Design a protein around this nucleic acid. Structure first.
Ligand SMILES: [Zn+2]
Ligand SMILES: [Zn+2]
Lengths: 184, 921, 70, 184
RNA sequence: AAAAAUCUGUGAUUUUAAUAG
RNA sequence: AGCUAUUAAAAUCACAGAUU
């Protein structure tokens, strides 16, 4: 549709260069003015749809992104934490996670007014020697004091004649109970 | 020497140790003196008395005053007539010879070291340095041992709760003094002596002395005057809880020997009247136990002040709504039938109907929100976690609420590190975080109403301050407006309990036609409608660990309250160039105009600010009521006298004292304020100016008028004292003269509880105006909270602007031929606002571009700052916004193949757009 | 170091809160005590100690699974 | 109304003269008619948009009015259930008894539940206060005798009466909520 | 289940005003 | 002879920041 106006525009604007009668030029220019007015209406109507199209696409892109993130928050957040703990230079975090990756892991931790209480599962003698040093437990970068020790349905290890006699003879795992020496 | 010391010892005693020998001892003591040349309440040095210590007694000083023989004989005539009563210390009269002259002597036996005025003055002019008088009096009276003062913070009410226990031991001293004042005044009337009695005539023991200015008259028909005696002591007798001995119920609710029917009594009108005639017999003015019988606004303040003092003797369970039997659809009920206020007394409804049926929405709406029916039909409760009284609990049981942490914005944080922020150089670091809270965050924060206490004002001085503070608000207009003409900005907000269970405020504002809103409003002008607030925890970024609660007032309270205040409140925000700033913008050069207007006209200027510790909790009941009286004083033609009273009660019953619902239990609130009120930001402002003016009046009276030379100030002091303690009506001519004196030397800028002051420095040093040492005094006995000097600031030069106002520092820069101020925030606030977000979807910035725009607008002023690190704060936000826009455009192109044009949105990462918002005019 | 610690513990309560430690107050009063104090701490040495106390508690809830941080 | 037809008829006559070379004396009259017809058509057409936009205004108002009626009728019928739900719970036999003892038939609201209710909930902080409240397993409050029926700890779990002894008290999760009932 | 106010930013709809054909 | 385009202002709706 717009091509029609341009063809008339090119011819009639060039007609000024020839000896066309002025009265015809006035009519010729009047037609050209009408054509230009129609073109402007085409531009306004067409572009008003074009800008609406841009807004719809951008709006739905944002909506698609938002609904996508909320569907996987819990699993993603765990990766976010363990990716952050790497950035820290401290070696304490490596020691704890290295132990957890191994066979030694903590059981329920009990807050208390007097002192926090730990429970640790030691599957083998090597695991027991990992954390026990000088008769105390070295976990979470602090000295934990042992109170009692628990067997597999028993407490016979309590006498602490355990370093060699118990490893060969009795069953495992071996569980410890400790309290924090220093209160936070 | 020795011969004179012989007779002073008396004819029936011995063991006197001379403190200064035969010569008089110089000492500083407080006085309340009105005279042809001086009118002061400060302290003066005296020379005419010799003081001797008695060794046998705990505290007994023989003080002998020597004067001209005629004066000595004058006192003897007065003493001989009064001595037979039980309130005069033992006097002995004699004369002694000198080498060339004769002079008289008056000897008093067993007078304590400090008069009553010293105790009152030492508590109403207080600062943690040079406090030896108050410390001394506590030891000698026996309130606390000297080891107590070893604690470095013994004086702080909000950090040493035991202090209120120590002062109560002084209650016996204050109460004992008054019962001896009435006994003395009776002796005056019978014996026929005309004079003015004041505090400095009385010992801590209660005996009177030094009555040399009294004059004789015919027996009977004597005239004692005690306006200044009781008025000056009023804050002390409420701070020290002197009426504890008069408690009506002396049994514990948890005791097994208690009785049930005792809880029912509510009418204590006779009890209060009996006390008034027992202690304040010669107070003179009338006293109406129920404030509904009063005549003026000044009388309602006058009587309500006494009721607050006498409320300490009434049980805590007697207050609250008074309910009555009622019938609905033929089945019985319990419905409100009045109210019992701590201040205003008992008020009865004028409209209650006992039979109703086919309920309309109006009858149905107010029945549902009225606590009477819900509280009565639920089990009782005893909550030991809070001191506040509380009896109710939902049939579903109680619960608890926790507060979760914030969400970490990883992408933005990595951006800051790449730009070089948060380097270990320690230039800038995070300071604002999202804090978590345990399960009992709400109730343990409602427990902080412990700090609210029953303060009593010295009414003789709160009359003038009420006049001056009102002059600040005479510019604005006010009145009632029809429901057709109100404006509400947010219809999508909670309607309170229990209406929030069905829909938000929008539903009720369209269900109620205009005629039904005006029917309800007109009903409230003749009845009292109690309602419940709900405690909800604010979830926002903060720099302090303590949790903060905000109450949501029921809809029927705000729907009616703002229709009564809207016209006045909207006038405060439209008026520009006044003390209250609530309506001024900080953009478009608004900040410069505010400061340049404040500083103009003050000679030799200085700049200060101040802080109220725990304003929401410690705000006294009396000064919150006055804030409601001042804002309603504009209703002069649209409402009669009784219509304004029942609109005042509706504010007290729905805001001040309330039934608070939190976590499934209903508690009875003791007082203070709640942020959810319709007049929060404006009721605080009136209270703020009340303290600022009350600090000026308190100190101006205390400057020694015998050395003042600024005749305008000297005359003002004398007129001020005369207008307070020796006049029945305030002449408004003086108030306009005094109010026109503050505006020249003590200009103010107030906005809710935050404000700044520019004050003449020369006058303050001498004491003609307020000072930080004066704000400590007014808060201690008007708010009983200690204002630590580290929480307030002073700026001796104006070129730097205020140190901190509205949590934004100020800087001055020179540009072209003009110089102007600019506000900039704390840099850590802008950075921390982006790293930590309160919603998970906000972790992805591309979804919300406009959050960092409108956050860089606040950060632009930093671009002018000197420190290069502060400069980066603004420019990093421009790069961040540039990164987001270019990411979204490319993302949409790839995903949907339509390219967004960047020309339209290219103005948001160029500083020219932001600079236009801080350009004058 | 310090600003990494103050942000590595905001995500920990996010993991613990998701795991529903809020049910029993005794274990939620233990974590919120550390979360509040670690944010206000200025000494990096002490802030590290609290983080390890909070991290040790988190592992006890059986949330290790697969680890890349050997 | 018929303007569009009139314009079309004028247009047909205009071209039916121009296309064949009709004398200008007639073409000029037709061209004037086209201006009259087209301009008349345009002015009349201006009413169409006004009518159309008033129609949508009416539709929006009618729907808005209709929706408001449904919302209003919903809430009021919901409040009847709430109000009459509470009327079923009142123990008016007990409440009316105390209203007779009151001198003027009026009592404070903060005293009705504590004097007339049949169930009491007590929240205790420490065993030092528990043993102060409980005596032989009964509680006295407001000069009335109550006995303990049920106990629940902070987490919401049930706690036995025999389990609140001193040694086991440390293990419990305080505060402790007691449910009591009256004996008459 | 998340309050009373003030100020500012972005977008959409309607109307009005000015300039141009 | 009244109809089309670009700016400015007001109102309504939605979302987002800062302050007491
Ligand atoms: Zn009165
Ligand atoms: Zn009015």
């Amino acid at each position: 549709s717009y091509v029609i106006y341009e063809n008339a525009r090119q011819q009639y604007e060039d007609a000024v260069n020839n000896g066309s009668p002025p009265q015809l030029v006035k009519q010729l220019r009047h037609a050209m003015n009408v054509a230009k007015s129609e073109f402007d209406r085409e531009a306004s109507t067409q572009r008003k749809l074009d800008r609406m199209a841009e807004q719809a696409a951008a709006q739905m892109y944002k909506e698609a992104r938002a609904v996508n993130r909320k569907s996987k928050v819990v699993s993603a957040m765990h990766s976010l934490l363990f990716g952050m703990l790497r950035r820290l230079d401290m070696s304490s975090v490596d020691t704890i996670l290295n132990l957890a990756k191994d066979g030694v892991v903590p059981l329920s931790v009990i807050p208390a007014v007097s002192a926090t209480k730990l429970n640790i599962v030691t599957s083998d003698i090597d695991s027991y020697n990992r954390i026990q040093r000088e008769g105390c437990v070295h976990y979470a970068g602090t000295i934990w004091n042992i109170i009692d020790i628990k067997d597999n349905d028993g407490k016979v290890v309590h006498v602490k004649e355990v370093t060699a006699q118990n490893a060969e003879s009795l069953s495992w795992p071996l569980v410890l109970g400790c309290e924090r020496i220093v209160k936070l | 020497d020795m011969a004179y010391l012989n007779r002073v010892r008396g004819s029936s005693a011995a063991r006197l140790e001379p403190c200064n020998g035969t010569d008089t001892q110089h000492v500083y003591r407080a006085f309340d003196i009105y005279n042809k040349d001086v009118a002061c309440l400060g302290k003066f040095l005296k020379v005419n008395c010799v003081r001797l210590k008695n060794l046998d007694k705990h505290d007994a000083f023989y003080v002998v005053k020597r004067c001209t023989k005629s004066a000595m004989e004058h006192e003897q005539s007065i003493y001989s007539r009064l001595e037979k009563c039980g309130a005069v210390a033992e006097h002995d009269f004699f004369t002694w010879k000198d080498g060339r002259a004769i002079y008289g002597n008056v000897c008093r036996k067993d007078l304590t070291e400090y008069t009553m005025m010293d105790l009152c003055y030492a508590l109403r002019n207080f600062d943690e340095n040079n406090c030896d008088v108050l410390k001394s009096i506590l030891i000698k009276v026996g309130a606390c041992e000297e080891s107590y003062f070893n604690n470095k913070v013994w004086f702080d009410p909000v950090e040493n709760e035991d202090i209120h226990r120590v002062y109560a031991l002084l209650g016996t001293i204050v109460s004992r003094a008054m019962l001896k004042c009435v006994k003395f005044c009776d002796a005056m009337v019978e014996q026929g002596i005309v004079g003015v009695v004041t505090l400095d005539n009385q010992d801590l023991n209660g005996d009177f002395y030094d009555f040399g200015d009294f004059t004789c008259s015919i027996k009977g028909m004597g005239i004692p005057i005690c306006t200044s005696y009781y008025s000056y002591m009023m804050p002390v007798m409420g701070m020290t809880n002197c009426l504890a001995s008069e408690c009506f119920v002396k049994s514990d609710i948890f005791g097994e020997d208690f009785k049930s029917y005792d809880l029912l009594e509510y009418d204590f009108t006779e009890h209060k009247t009996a006390l008034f005639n027992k202690y304040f017999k010669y107070w003179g003015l009338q006293y109406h136990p129920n404030c509904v019988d009063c005549s003026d606004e000044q009388c309602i303040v006058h009587c309500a002040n006494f009721n607050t003092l006498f409320s300490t003797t009434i049980p805590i369970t007697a207050f609250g709504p008074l309910c009555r039997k009622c019938w609905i659809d033929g089945v019985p009920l319990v419905t409100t039938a009045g109210y019992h206020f701590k201040q205003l007394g008992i008020v009865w409804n004028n409209d209650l109907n006992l039979h109703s049926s086919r309920l309309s929405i109006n009858e149905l709406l107010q029945f549902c929100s009225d606590p009477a029916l819900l509280i009565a039909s639920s089990p009782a409760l005893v909550d030991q976690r809070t001191v506040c009284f509380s009896v109710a609990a939902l049939g579903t049981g109680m619960t608890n609420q926790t507060v979760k942490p914030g969400h970490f914005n990883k992408e933005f944080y990595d951006f800051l590190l790449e730009q070089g922020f948060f380097s270990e150089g320690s230039e800038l670091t995070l300071k604002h975080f999202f804090f978590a809270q345990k399960g009992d965050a709400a109730v343990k924060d409602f427990d902080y109403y412990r700090y609210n206490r029953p303060t009593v004002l010295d009414i003789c001085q709160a009359r003038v301050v009420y006049q001056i503070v009102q002059r600040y608000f005479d510019i604005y207009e006010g009145g009632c407006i029809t429901a057709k003409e109100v404006v509400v900005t947010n219809l999508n907000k909670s309607a309170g309990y229990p209406l929030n269970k069905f829909g938000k405020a929008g539903l009720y504002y369209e269900s109620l036609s205009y005629e039904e809103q005006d029917e309800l409003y007109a009903y409230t002008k003749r009845n009292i409608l109690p309602t419940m607030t709900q405690l909800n925890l604010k979830y926002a970024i903060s720099g302090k660990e303590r949790a903060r609660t905000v109450g949501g007032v029921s809809l029927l309270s705000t729907m009616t309250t703002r229709q009564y205040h809207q016209k006045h409140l909207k006038s405060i925000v439209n008026t520009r160039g006044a003390s209250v700033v609530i309506g001024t913008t900080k953009f478009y050069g608004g900040w410069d105009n505010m400061l340049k207007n404040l500083i103009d006209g003050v000679e030799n200027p200085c700049l200060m600010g101040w802080d109220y510790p725990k304003c929401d909790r410690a705000l006294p009941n009396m000064i919150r009521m006055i804030s409601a009286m001042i804002l309603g004083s504009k209703h002069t033609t649209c409402c009669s006298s009784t219509d304004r009273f029942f609109r005042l009660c509706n504010e007290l019953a729905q805001v001040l004292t309330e039934v608070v619902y939190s976590n499934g239990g209903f508690y009875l609130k003791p007082g203070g304020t709640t942020s959810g009120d319709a007049t929060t930001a404006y009721a605080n402002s009136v209270f703020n100016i009340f303290q600022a003016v009350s600090a000026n009046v308190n100190k101006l009276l205390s400057v020694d008028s015998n050395v003042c030379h600024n005749l305008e100030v000297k005359q003002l002091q004398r007129k001020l004292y005369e207008c307070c303690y020796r006049s029945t009506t305030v002449d408004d001519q003086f108030v306009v003269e005094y109010y026109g004196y503050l505006r020249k030397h003590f200009s103010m800028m107030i906005l809710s509880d935050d404000g700044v002051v520019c004050y003449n420095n020369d006058y303050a040093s001498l004491g003609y105006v307020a000072d930080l040492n004066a704000f400590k005094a007014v808060l201690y006995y008007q708010n009983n909270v200690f204002m630590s000097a580290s929480k307030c600031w002073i700026e001796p030069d104006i070129n730097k602007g205020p140190h901190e106002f509205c949590s934004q520092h100020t800087m001055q820069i020179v540009d072209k031929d003009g110089t102007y101020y600019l506000p900039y925030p704390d840099p850590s606030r802008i950075l921390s606002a982006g790293v930590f977000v309160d919603d998970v979807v906000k972790t992805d910035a591309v979804v919300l571009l406009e959050r960092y725009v409108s956050l860089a607008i606040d950060a632009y002023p930093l671009s002018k700052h000197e420190n290069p690190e502060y400069k980066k704060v603004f420019y990093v936000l421009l790069d961040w916004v540039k990164h987001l826009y270019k990411t979204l455009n490319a993302g949409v192109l790839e995903s949907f193949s339509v390219t967004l044009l960047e020309d339209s949105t290219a103005k948001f990462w160029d500083e020219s757009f932001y600079a236009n918002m801080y350009e004058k005019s | 170091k310090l600003t990494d610690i103050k942000c590595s513990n905001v995500v920990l309560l996010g993991c613990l809160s998701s795991m529903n430690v809020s049910a029993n107050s005794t274990e939620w009063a233990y974590c919120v005590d550390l979360h509040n104090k670690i944010n206000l701490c200025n000494d990096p040495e002490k802030a590290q100690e609290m983080l390890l106390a909070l991290l040790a508690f988190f592992l006890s809830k059986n949330s290790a699974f697969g680890l890349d941080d050997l």
